[PDB]
From a paper:
To determine whether the features of the MoFeAlkaline-inactivated state stem solely from the loss of HCA, we characterized the homocitrate-deficient [name]-protein purified from the homocitrate synthase (nifV) deletion strain of [name] ([name]ΔNifV). Like MoFeAlkaline-inactivated, [name]ΔNifV showed similar SEC shifts in elution time relative to MoFeAs-isolated and had diminished levels of acetylene reduction. Likewise, EPR spectroscopy revealed a loss of the canonical as-isolated S = 3/2 signal from the FeMo-cofactor in the [name]ΔNifV form, comparable to the MoFeAlkaline-inactivated state. No density was observed at the canonical HCA position within the active site of the disordered α-subunit, but a smaller density remains in the HCA pocket within the corresponding ordered α-subunit. No homocitrate was detected by IC-MS, but citrate was isolated from the [name]ΔNifV sample at a molar ratio of 0.2-mole citrate per mole [name]ΔNifV. In our work, ~39 moles Fe and 1.8 Mo per molecule of [name]ΔNifV were detected by ICP-MS of the purified protein, suggestive of a full complement of clusters. The Phe α300 side chain is flipped in the disordered α-subunit of [name]ΔNifV, however, His α362, His α442, and His α451 remain close to their resting state positions in both dimers, preventing the formation of the histidine coordination site. In addition, while Gln β93 remained close to the as-isolated position in [name]ΔNifV, Trp α253 was observed to undergo the same conformational change as observed in the MoFeAlkaline-inactivated state in its more ordered α-subunit.
Nitrogenase catalyzes the ATP-dependent reduction of dinitrogen to ammonia during the process of biological nitrogen fixation that is essential for sustaining life. The Fe-protein mediates ATP-dependent electron transfer (ET) through its [4Fe:4S] cluster to the intermediate [8Fe:7S] P-cluster in the [name]-protein; the electrons are subsequently shuttled to a [7Fe:1Mo:9S:1C]-R-homocitrate metallocluster, the FeMo-cofactor, within the active site of the [name]-protein. The active site FeMo-cofactor contains a [7Fe:1Mo:9S:1C] metallocluster coordinated with an R-homocitrate (HCA) molecule.
Numbering used by the authors:
A (entry chain A): 5 to 13, 20 to 24, 27 to 35, 41 to 407, 418 to 480
B (entry chain B), C (entry chain D): 2 to 523
D (entry chain C): 4 to 480
């Protein structure tokens, strides 16, 4: 009950009470504030939100982790943003380009080192279609000016070089990294084809924004969208190229998957180019059908007819998936804790498998995300914002994965899909239901107690 | 489309004809991709010696490094003490990355906290951050000790760890008697092994520098063992087992094997085992201190020699036959305990395995990389097996270490075709394995990408990867292995010979083509 | 032609153009080979369900069996006793084959003699052969005991081992007090495990049958452990280690781990370790006897319950979590020693490993073969992991064992698509893996050939082999592994999950084709 | 070691044997005398093994199924009897071949009748007929069946010749009954003889009245080369380079049609005299085909054998022989230059089955190594007649040496290298002496011909100069 959860909800300062609530979110929960020091939080940094999330999945561009070696090393290939390309030749997603700052670079700056690095990148990787420079913590503290270096080298090499001031100490979490990376996209990449009219546009031109192709989720969404008669001109960042970002201002509709990480750019495109945008949810058959119908409602009747055809075609497959896996998953309760979008976007498929969601929370989401989350959750459920480490299933990240695993609760990685996926679309729903069954009903959870104890 | 009776994950779901057609449409319509012929030409160029010459002229660009930053090693050192919380003064994203890295390698919970320094700390410093972080950490996680390292931001803005912790104790945020050892770990100096060295030296100086008046060397009849940056639990276990078999009293300083191998019994233990504060306080009373990885324990060596007055032996890493023999002999000399017959039988069994597998191991060419001590021990063992370590790469090595490895190689006729590289990354090694192809690679999971690249050139140019080192992400429970001592030597030898034999079996599986050599008995 | 700087062995020397031309000339001129289209047609036919129906109708033909003859197991049992020479009454070619088999599996010397019965001995028996052989063996190799088994020739002509040995002692060829236990091991009955059972029962009967008057059950406060036909040294070692951890006094009867793991220290040891004659004589005084592999120790169980009056517990092989738990609890109940905290922690660590790798292991399909107890323990562990043991084959299995394994499969949701085959060989399993393809095979080295066959049908039809069992010839030092207890379960789990991961890496290494799923972290 | 020292050593080794065993073993140990041409005056061979002395000899089944008949690839060989004999011999010999295993080639598979108690009690003739029917059903591309008898077959009175006759007449298929029961004879030599008799009686004369084969003056067959690691291929490439046409290969990579075509060749080149002299003499007396022994072990023996073979043909073949020798001279000279300085002066002790203890001596001498002890498992006295002139003076000769005897000989002589089988390899590796498997080529090879000499030299250097042999003593002892 609500009373029980309130009773369930540290020195005097440890704020934490405002970030915990029982399901205008601002009057109920307080979000996007500083983490309490020394409390083992899950939050990343602005560099992770910019390099690791927004810019890193862009395959034909080379992203330089400007600064010491650690930040680039720990984020190398850790995110499963899938792509197609020849790595090291025309795609560089899983590679780690770093300036590897030393003591002399801290003392005297690394602007000359950055220029030399850009020259060497051009020499050794000629097929790169652009360079981004993701700043790490020392860059903004030693007075380095990467904007001037980027301008000079871009003019000299006729290359698009995007300086991103994504120093980790900026902001409270990866959300400011998302904002900074979106601003960099707007300032350096988005408006490159403003005077270019050589692109042949169609009335059914859509772009996919904020889908990072985790396990191929964006591909599973795109196949449904194109089966519907639409043309996905742009799809970034997941399996995204720089040309797609440049061609995004030419589409007729923007489909934003992660509102948290791309609302800035969606709003900017709406003000500037007049492109309407809306959110879509392809998680679970019910949300997928609802989103497909809503998308088709923005076009002529032929798109709606093709949408009905697609829904009818895919109905038997997800119906068979439900018939197979729902009996093994009825009456199971789920609690979640993911970064900024998934904590409310995953409820649909859990309900489509007969599961009850009793808990969710966000690492870094803002109060608008909690506004959206309130209706998606039932009452008397605990909501937590930036909850510290201190049900039948818990869906969260890798760092809490092993804590909850050793506490005995079956756990699912809701960041990387536990190295599985995709989870979006109908094929994603099939994979997701199979993974839910394999994790929840595994015998390994029945053997935690020794028979002699 | 999915069959409910056979559900495909991303592989091979995206190999379906509809997915293939959609991806082809994407590429042809909007990606503006380079033509496949240009991509093939550029790849072939990257496989050549002209590209290698350009690659090795690199000055400012680092591609695919084989090292991490200091606070990671500092966290690993802090995890080796009893009920100790690693506390990294600086930004929280660093701690998130550290915990994710160690979680992926060990597949265990990793405990670490940050004071979450932000732009406000960029101007006034992180003094308030340190006070609040120490208070909250002690109140919430109840550790017996908080070991403080730094991120690059705290080092750049010049935060005084000593003064900050002293002020925290004076203002009542933490008790004056609560142990808060600290170490400055500048991520732009050295690598993670340097951070381990700095953290251990800081803890030792905290617990022993002010109480040297009553310390007598050898008064507890024990030998201190400092393992360094070690990511195999079997290494700690084998050192403790070998010392127990000899009957040698020892104190393993920074022992994290218990907290990195907690059982799944239904309860979460944030702390388990570790070096106690009493052990660290009594460390100056030991007979001697033996550094398992001397090439990244320089600062620890200076502290132990100059403060504890311990005559630290000039021992190499106890890796392989000869160096394990010298380690055991030195321990026997220090402690006065004879080497027991069980260890002699273990050594004889290792030699027996060597004689059994020498025909398949002889002459094999290897590209290897990793930390300095690990790399040199692997090179020494490979030379003992009659193998050829052609490429020896160490991103965090120095000129003195390179000189030592060159001296090791010169003493063996099998090190004639061997070159040692320091300051080079895995792109350099990719160029090396393309232009001078070895039989196998030995290294962490990152080398897998190099393998893929080699397979792109051809099956006859593919260099398989043998996964020994840190971090290993794509295989399960390999962190449980051993690389030290005779047991670690046997495990490494078995891995090498069986990798050779698996490669041979794969090459000879072609029916009526190469299966004349598909021998049942090898 | 050969290059002195790069010398090619048969592979890839015979892939050269001149060798290919010479082989093509041979084939086209004189081999009268069937056309390649006909060969491909017949292969595709052999891969079909019609061929499977024809194959499973076999009654007289056995192709690629998965078992050996009894005297092999008798020799293995005899090697487990102190200074005991295996002596196989019969033809010497049998002993040559036994020694070659065990040498190839263990890569260790194997001592065994024969009396070299010939055509003359086929008419008047091998009495003179036995007398001369016993005298020669005792004089030359100086064993404390000679354990006598038989070959098929000695069984067919009906040589009386008891009468022959008694006569040999009567005429003074060997001393009357010298221990010469004997066993009849007909190769046309059962298999090698039956021979192990017969030899152990013969030794136990020789040492205990006539001296039961002064025996009191439980008077020495020990438990007898009979391991059966075991070709993993780690299994003996793990049983001894676990029994020592619990504080349980034990007597491992037939312990060959020392003589099969002698060190290479410049001298050759014909004998090393083994069960002593004092232990065998005192065995009836134990609290109880535990048979580690009860499904091929029926005669031993009959003798132990009938003569020693030991209430042998109904226990499965200590393979996997649940059966290791039951073995430990039964040992605790018999001895009265509580299960210590170390074994509980080891169990928890095995469960942790199970939880870490359950995503990759769940739902994976396995064909598997081996000996009855090993196969049933492996099936039980696979069911504990969430895997599907689709094809369960045991050539030396019987109807009662098949019923027990069916009862095991019916108690698990993952045994639905599982079928148990007894009396079937590896050609039957080849048909099974062609018509109902599993993800992996688990068995000895012979299964490698099946893998080759599957790869001939296509890379998508290839069934990779996981080498667990006996004999493993194409890999080195795998005989040192463990399959019993929590340690053996961890080793098996690591092998399985890492085999899955290597297969996934190989299937996703295609650049710009399937390498979108070539994940660094798995 | 001088002659008297070797005789004294023989006496000390024999001292521990019982009276009968010592008297029997004194006839099988000798000090070599290269001037002696009658080996029965110094050594006695092809006798019964002393019971309970750990001999290395196999059985007649091993010499027939494992040696002569098994390498035939398109034939299916049934190990008639219990399962063990066929199981232990499956794929244990590296007789290389080309073919699709299970479709048209069956070398590495194990076909057995898997005798049970009822088959022992009531016989296995009906089981053999049904097995032949099932073989024909499931392996339609087999070009013949052989039935290798194991020990129980000859003791229960089974008539496999009648079954073979009836089933061969019914199926129009060649079924060869081989009476190779293991108890027959004293070693694998009788197995070789029985298998040769079976070839002569059932396979060799199948095309006696056939004349469709186009014969050339340069027609040769290779008899007794079993392609261990590709040895026969490396010999055959050299033979074809001299302009000769190799029609048959016995039996490594050998087909049944090559055996049937052998009586059409102009010369028989016998590598293994021990296992194929019977069939070679039969072919000489029946078809008038001359036979000569050749040696392709090492460069000097290969060159001598090539010239001797070319001397049996016209001058064009001799010109081609000289061209081949000139072509391969630089390669083996480079091999010698690289490896002889690493191997010169080393001492080798050998103990192999019946041909290699004397055939490989030239290869060792080509690298500067001297053979100080040699012996056979199952050779006759003609093999020793050929062996004494090859061996040096005052060297050791052992026939059917026992484990104790050969271990003591190694202990007293202390050679640098030992070449023997798998049942002594680990004994001598633990004793500390570098060991090379001279049966399977230690899973390496080929060793025949110029291409094999490079591998042989590299393997000798690899084993003999391995660092492991310098690490057997712990530094604290
Ligand atoms: S971008 Fe964000 S933490 Fe919106 S930083 Fe994070 S691939 Fe999460 S809840 Mo990892 S705001 Fe994406 C996210 Fe959500 S990396 Fe992925 S799963 S939908
Ligand atoms: S056939 Fe004989 S034992 Fe002549 S049974 Fe044996 S493949 Fe030996 S010395 Mo193994 S008479 Fe051949 C032989 Fe020599 S199996 Fe090979 S090496 S040249
Ligand atoms: S919050 Fe973010 S990840 Fe942290 S540093 Fe800052 S940009 Fe980077 Fe980098 S090298 Fe190591 S991991 Fe840091 S201490 Fe510096
Ligand atoms: S001397 Fe030779 S190998 Fe020996 S039996 Fe006889 S033919 Fe055969 Fe066979 S099944 Fe086992 S291994 Fe024998 S006891 Fe019989
Ligand atoms: Fe774990
Ligand atoms: Fe060995």
């Amino acid at each position: 009950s609500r009373e029980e959860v309130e009773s369930l909800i540290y020195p005097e300062k440890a704020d934490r009470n405002k970030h915990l609530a029982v399901n205008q979110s601002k009057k109920c929960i307080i979000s996007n504030k500083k983490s309490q020091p020394g409390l083992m939080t899950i939050r990343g940094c602005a560099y992770a939100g910019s390099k690791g999330v927004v810019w890193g999945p862009i395959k034909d561009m080379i992203h330089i982790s400007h600064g010491p070696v650690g930040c680039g090393q720990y984020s190398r290939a850790g995110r499963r943003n899938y792509y197609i390309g020849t790595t090291g030749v025309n795609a560089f997603v899983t590679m780690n380009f770093t300036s590897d700052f030393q003591e002399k670079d801290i003392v005297f700056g690394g602007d000359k080192k950055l220029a030399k690095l850009i020259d060497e990148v051009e020499t050794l990787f000629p097929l790169n279609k652009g360079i981004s420079v993701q700043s790490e913590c020392p860059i903004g503290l030693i007075g380095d000016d990467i904007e001037s270096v980027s301008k000079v080298k871009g003019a000299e090499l006729s290359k698009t070089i995007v300086p991103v001031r994504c120093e980790g100490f900026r902001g409270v979490s990866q959300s400011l990294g998302h904002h900074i990376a979106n601003d960099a996209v707007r300032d350096w990449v988005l408006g490159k084809r403003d005077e270019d009219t050589t692109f042949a546009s169609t009335p059914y031109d859509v772009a996919i924004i904020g889908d990072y192709n985790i396990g191929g989720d964006a591909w599973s969404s795109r196949i449904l969208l194109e089966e519907m008669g639409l043309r996905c001109v742009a799809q970034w960042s997941g399996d995204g190229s720089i040309s797609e970002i440049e061609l995004t201002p030419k589409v007729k509709l923007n489909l934003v998957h992660c509102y948290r990480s791309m609302n800035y750019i969606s709003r900017h495109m709406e003000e500037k180019y007049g492109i309407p945008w809306m959110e879509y949810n392809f998680f679970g058959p019910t949300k997928t059908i609802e989103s497909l119908r809503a998308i088709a409602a923005k076009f002529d009747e032929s798109i709606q007819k093709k949408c009905e055809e697609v829904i009818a075609k895919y109905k038997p497959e997800w119906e068979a998936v439900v018939a197979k896996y729902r009996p093994r998953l009825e009456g199971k309760r789920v609690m979640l804790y993911i970064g900024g979008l998934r904590p409310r976007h995953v409820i649909g498929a859990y309900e489509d498998l007969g599961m009850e969601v009793v808990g969710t929370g966000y690492e870094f989401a803002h109060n608008d995300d909690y506004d959206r989350t309130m209706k998606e959750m039932g009452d008397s459920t605990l909501l937590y914002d930036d909850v510290t480490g201190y049900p039948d299933l818990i869906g969260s990240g890798i760092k809490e994965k092993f804590i909850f695993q050793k506490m005995g609760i079956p756990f699912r990685e809701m960041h990387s899909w536990d190295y599985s996926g995709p989870y979006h679309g109908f094929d994603g729903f099939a994979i997701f239901a199979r993974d839910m069954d394999m994790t929840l009903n595994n015998p390994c959870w029945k053997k935690l107690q020794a028979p002699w104890e | 489309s999915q069959q409910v009776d056979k559900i495909k994950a991303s592989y091979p779901l995206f190999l379906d004809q509809d997915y293939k057609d959609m991806l082809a449409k994407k590429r042809d319509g909007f990606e503006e991709k380079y033509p496949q012929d240009k991509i093939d030409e550029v790849f072939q160029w990257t496989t050549t010696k002209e590209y290698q010459e350009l690659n090795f002229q690199r000055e400012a660009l680092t591609v695919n490094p084989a090292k991490a930053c200091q606070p990671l090693g500092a966290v690993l050192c802090a995890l080796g003490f009893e009920k100790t919380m690693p506390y990294v003064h600086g930004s929280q994203g660093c701690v998130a990355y550290f915990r994710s890295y160690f979680n992926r390698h060990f597949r265990e919970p990793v405990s670490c906290v940050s004071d979450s320094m932000t732009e406000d700390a960029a101007v006034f410093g992180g003094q308030q951050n340190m006070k609040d972080g120490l208070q909250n950490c002690k109140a919430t996680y109840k550790p017996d000790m908080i070991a403080v390292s730094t991120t690059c931001m705290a080092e750049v803005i010049g935060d005084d760890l000593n003064a900050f912790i002293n002020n925290s104790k004076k203002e009542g945020f933490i008790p004056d008697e609560f142990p808060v050892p600290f170490a400055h770990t500048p991520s732009f100096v050295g690598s993670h092994v340097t951070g381990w060295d700095n953290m251990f030296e800081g803890i030792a100086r905290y617990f022993t520098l002010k109480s040297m008046d009553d310390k007598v060397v050898g008064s507890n009849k024990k030998i201190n063992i400092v393992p360094g940056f070690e990511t195999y639990l079997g290494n700690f276990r084998v050192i403790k087992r070998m010392l127990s078999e000899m009957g040698v009293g020892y104190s393993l300083l920074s022992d994290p094997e218990e907290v990195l191998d907690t059982p799944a019994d239904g309860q979460f233990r944030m702390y388990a085992g570790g070096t106690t504060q009493e052990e660290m306080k009594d460390a100056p009373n030991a007979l001697n201190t033996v550094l398992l990885q001397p090439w990244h324990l320089e600062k620890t060596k200076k502290f132990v020699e100059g403060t504890w007055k311990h005559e630290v032996p000039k021992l190499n890493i106890p890796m392989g036959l000869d160096w394990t023999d010298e380690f055991l002999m030195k321990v026997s000399e220090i402690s006065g305990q004879p080497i027991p017959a069980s260890l002699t039988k273990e050594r004889g069994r290792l030699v027996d395995m060597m004689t059994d597998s020498h025909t398949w191991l002889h002459g094999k060419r290897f590209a290897l990389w990793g930390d300095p001590d690990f790399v040199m021990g692997l090179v020494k063992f490979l030379l003992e097996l009659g193998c050829e370590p052609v490429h020896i790469l160490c991103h965090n090595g120095n000129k003195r270490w390179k000189k030592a490895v060159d001296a090791i190689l010169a003493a063996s006729p099998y090190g004639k075709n061997a070159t040692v590289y320091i300051g080079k990354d895995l792109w350099h090694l990719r160029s090396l394995v393309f232009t001078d192809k070895p039989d196998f690679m030995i290294g962490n999971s990152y080398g897998k990408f190099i393998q893929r690249d080699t397979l792109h050139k051809g099956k006859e140019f593919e260099v398989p990867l043998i996964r020994i080192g840190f971090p290993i992400f794509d295989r399960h429970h390999l962190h449980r292995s051993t690389t030290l001592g005779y047991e670690g030597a046997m495990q490494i030898l078995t891995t090498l010979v069986n990798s050779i034999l698996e490669r041979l079996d794969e090459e000879t599986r072609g029916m009526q083509a190469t299966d004349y050599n598909h021998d049942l008995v090898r």
